[PDB]
Amino acid sequence: KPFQCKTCQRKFSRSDHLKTHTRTHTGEK
Numbered sequence: 800k801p802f803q804c805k806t807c808q809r810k811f812s813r814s815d816h817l818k819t820h821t822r823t824h825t826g827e828k
């Protein structure tokens with residue numbers, strides 16, 4: 800169940816993983 804970040808281009812194994820990660824780029828809230 801591979802995931803990809805559409806912000807840097809890093810991969811993950813879970814959707815929750817991907818999310819936690821991506822929110823370190825903008826991490827709005």
Ligand SMILES: [Zn+2]
Nearest residue numbers: 804806807809
């Ligand atoms: Zn990223």
